[PDB]
Design a protein around this ligand. Structure first.
Ligand SMILES: [Mg+2]
Ligand SMILES: [Mg+2]
Ligand SMILES: [Mg+2]
Ligand SMILES: [Mg+2]
Ligand SMILES: [Mg+2]
Lengths: 114, 79, 98, 151, 96, 127
RNA sequence: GGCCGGGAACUCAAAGGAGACUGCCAGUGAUAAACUGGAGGAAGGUGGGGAUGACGUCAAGUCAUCAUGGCCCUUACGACCAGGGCUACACACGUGCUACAAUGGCGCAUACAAAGAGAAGCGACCUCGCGAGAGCAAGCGGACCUCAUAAAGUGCGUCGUAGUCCGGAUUGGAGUCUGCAACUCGACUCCAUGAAGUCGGAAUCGCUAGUAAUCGUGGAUCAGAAUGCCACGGUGAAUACGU
């Protein structure tokens, strides 16, 4: 089962399977199964080939996989080219939302070095 | 994101934008207010934003409508 | 009708103020069920004891607000006289409402 | 605890079976002061113990606990600049106390699914000894006999 | 505590009734989802020091801008100096 | 005539009654098992009634408010012992040994200034 | 449905009292002080906790809360206003929160608190929105009305040891709220992304019973920002041979 995006999970719930793909998570996973009329507890095993294309159609509406990866990256690359506060804050490797860079910026800034 | 319904701007700076259209653009205007937001009518008009020392020449562009004037003037000098 | 609710801060002040209203009413009149104790609201504050620094050292404060309810069941034209303006108010608030 | 000797306060017994020994056992297993979730693990372990081994209820864990009782322990001196270990006879109140502790600490090091199962597996290998608690009980005993000098 | 800041405070408090309070009825009911015109938002050229939640609420005696309780209307240091001299009714050492 | 006993346990006020009839447990218009008492503090309500000749001795109506699970449970424990005034001062002398008539003076400690909650002094830097 | 006569018992509520004083008994001790033990009692040897911090020390802290000696500036180190900074960033440390999970996560259902605060305020019920919230809009200056549907716990089901339905950082897109104003520099919500971390080196901190620990609520500050602080309750230990 290819299931739209290149990620192919197996031997898990339908709620777990949809969360693994990029651009789709726990909230939308309920909406995709509720639209097609599929239960949360059913596994990928014991599921027909015609039943796959219904879930494949709904996930294909919203932008997912490599298209959404570049959608966020292009909005960053555009925002960096504007010459703004947030733009210079991306490229230099520091927190954009306005967190403290004095201490506890270890996520966005990166590991300690001499 | 912020400001709810309607784009909040300053009154005095709106007259300077209408001056740039009606009387025509000449030079970059030195404005102390960072509170106003960029509009479509502000495209292709030179403006200048104060940030603790002197007004920086910030050129306005088509896609700058989505952000504020204050973002384009960094206050804290580094290096 | 004759629902009167009081307020006083002191641990024993209103006890003497709510005493005199009882024997004045029930002597000439009748009924007068008596003073209901009511729950005390206590506004507990805490402020820094030192003018500078010293987080561990502080002083605690409280203002106990004691309420009472009179409840006279008999509205006679005799007992309403000699009730008003023989209270001799010692800062005790009195209110006449339902 | 210098002048004031304690009164040794008595906890209440186990409400189901009536064993005061199991009342102390549930308290060691208890974490974050949750007695309700603690006993649920303990009872689940005890039911699987007597079923697997095919022995009686109360004496299954008792004989399992009796095997993990320490014979002796040592105390750190620090008197004349050199650290001396002096072996001493552990009391019956402290004997089962340390025994019930080393069952939970041994079960904590396992890589099994539930706390009821992993603790029951420790109780299962108490009678015939391959486990971690039976390795944990014999530690000071290897240091003991050598330290018999100091007494 | 710098009497010019208290003079600045007395100005700040004295503008609350004139420019706002009465004429601050504008923007409350008028600026809402009705029927738009942006000329109501162009009335914000007023002096601004009249603002309803601008004041630090300094202590009335000294003028300290820290520890100001709304009940007493005084700073923490002036609470202890007052309370130990009585003055606040039914106030004493809290212990329970 | 009715037979009354109060009791309480950590700000949990209870009101016990005892009558001579059937052995059904009524608590806040609900059964004993339907008062969720399955885990620890399951039979602490019937702890003072352990060492008695019972079979099916007494009616009981009990109503407790305040506290949580064990606070309401321990209020019924001490409440029934005061409600033994049907049997009066005879059977209490044996009940003195058990210590269920003892009202527990242990109450939750007040929070103190410069402490995290009542005892715990927050840590400090080195020496 | 205490909801409505009514009954005033009781819980709750708070004014005034009783009770716990080594005093009743036993033993030891110079026969005295006191100690150990027992009876009665709800509470026994300062009952538990708080307030209460001697004479003085460290020329300890606060001239920045105020007061005040002296000194100094005085068309300025004053005063007013806009914007900025106090929130920076190759680093180091302390104090907290949330974790690394099956005593737990997630979903549905369900039971039990106390202490508060509230009129320039807390906001039902109702309608709209997935939601934060918005409009309409009773009641109560407060044992009534409002915040408030407390959570751990418990009943079933799912997950079965993985960087995972563990953890939430960071970033993007799109919103609400307070206010002239949220870009520097916010809270909160929605969708999506899912860094590090799988019990932490030497070393170091607190606590002796309703305590450690864990899970929640409220208040002061305040227009709007608590994981801080203060206040409250729920569940609830282990171990004290010794100096
Ligand atoms: Mg002055
Ligand atoms: Mg302010
Ligand atoms: Mg004293
Ligand atoms: Mg000095
Ligand atoms: Mg997660």
């Amino acid at each position: 089962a290819r299931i739209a995006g290149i990620n192919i999970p197996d031997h898990k719930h339908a709620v777990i399977a949809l969360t693994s793909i990029y651009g789709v998570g726990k909230t939308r996973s309920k909406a995709i199964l509720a639209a097609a009329g599929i239960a949360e507890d059913v596994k990928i095993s014991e599921l027909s080939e015609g039943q796959i294309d219904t879930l494949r159609d709904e996930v294909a509406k919203f932008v997912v996989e490599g298209d959404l990866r570049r959608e966020i990256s292009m909005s960053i690359k555009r925002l960096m080219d504007l010459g703004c506060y947030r733009g210079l804050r991306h490229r230099r490797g520091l927190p954009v939302r306005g967190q403290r860079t004095k201490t506890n910026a270890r996520t966005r800034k990166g590991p300690r070095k001499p | 994101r912020s400001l709810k319904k309607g784009p909040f701007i300053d009154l005095h700076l709106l007259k300077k934008v209408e001056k740039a259209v009606e009387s025509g653009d000449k030079k970059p205007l030195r404005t102390w207010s960072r509170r106003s937001t960029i509009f479509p009518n502000m495209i292709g008009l030179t403006i200048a934003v104060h940030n603790g020392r002197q007004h920086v020449p910030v050129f306005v562009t088509d896609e700058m409508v989505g952000h504020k004037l204050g973002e384009f003037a960094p206050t804290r000098t580094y290096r | 009708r004759i629902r009167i609710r009081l307020k006083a801060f002191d641990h024993r002040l209103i006890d003497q103020a709510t005493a005199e209203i009882v024997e004045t009413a029930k002597r000439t009149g009748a009924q007068v069920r008596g003073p209901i104790p009511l729950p005390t609201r206590k506004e507990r504050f805490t402020v820094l004891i030192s003018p500078h620094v010293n987080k561990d050292a502080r002083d605690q404060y409280e203002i106990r607000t004691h309420l009472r309810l009179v409840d006279i069941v008999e509205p006679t034209e005799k007992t309403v006289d000699a009730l008003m303006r023989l209270d001799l108010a010692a800062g005790v608030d009195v209110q006449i409402s339902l | 605890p210098r002048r004031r000797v304690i009164g040794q306060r008595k906890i209440l017994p186990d409400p189901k079976f009536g064993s005061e020994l199991l009342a102390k056992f549930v308290n060691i297993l208890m974490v974050d002061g949750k007695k309700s979730t603690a006993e649920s693990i303990v009872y689940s372990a005890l039911e699987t113990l007597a079923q697997r081994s095919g022995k009686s209820e109360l004496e299954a864990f008792e004989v399992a606990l009796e095997n993990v009782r320490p014979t002796v322990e040592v105390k750190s001196r620090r008197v004349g600049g050199s650290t001396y270990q002096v072996p001493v006879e552990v009391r019956p109140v402290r004997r089962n106390a340390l025994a019930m502790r080393w069952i939970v600490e041994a079960a904590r090091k396992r890589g099994d699914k539930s706390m009821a199962l992993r603790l029951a597996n420790e109780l299962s290998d108490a009678a015939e000894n391959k486990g971690t608690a039976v390795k944990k009980r014999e530690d000071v005993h290897r240091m003991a006999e050598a330290n018999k000098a100091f007494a | 505590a710098k009497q010019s800041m208290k003079a600045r405070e007395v100005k700040r408090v004295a503008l609350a009734d004139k420019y706002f309070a009465k004429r601050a009825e504008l923007k409350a009911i008028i600026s809402d989802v009705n029927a738009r015109w942006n000329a109501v938002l162009k009335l914000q050229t007023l002096p601004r020091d009249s603002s309803p939640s601008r004041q630090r609420n300094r202590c009335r005696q000294t003028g300290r801008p820290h520890g100001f309780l709304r009940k007493f209307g005084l700073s923490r240091i002036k609470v202890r100096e007052a309370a130990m001299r009585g003055e606040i009714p039914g106030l004493k050492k809290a212990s329970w | 005539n009715q037979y009354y006993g109060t009791g309480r346990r950590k700000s949990s006020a209870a009101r016990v009654f005892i009558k001579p009839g059937n052995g059904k447990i009524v608590i806040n218009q609900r059964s004993l098992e339907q008062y969720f008492g399955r885990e620890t503090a399951r039979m602490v309500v019937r702890q003072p009634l352990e060492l008695v000749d019972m079979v099916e001795k007494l009616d009981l109506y009990i109503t407790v408010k305040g506290g949580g699970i064990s606070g309401q449970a321990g209020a019924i424990r001490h409440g029934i012992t005061r409600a033994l005034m049907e049997y009066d001062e005879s059977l209490r002398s044996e009940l003195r040994k058990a210590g269920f008539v003892t009202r527990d003076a242990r109450q939750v400690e007040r929070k103190k200034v410069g402490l995290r909650k009542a005892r715990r002094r927050p840590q400090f830097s080195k020496r």
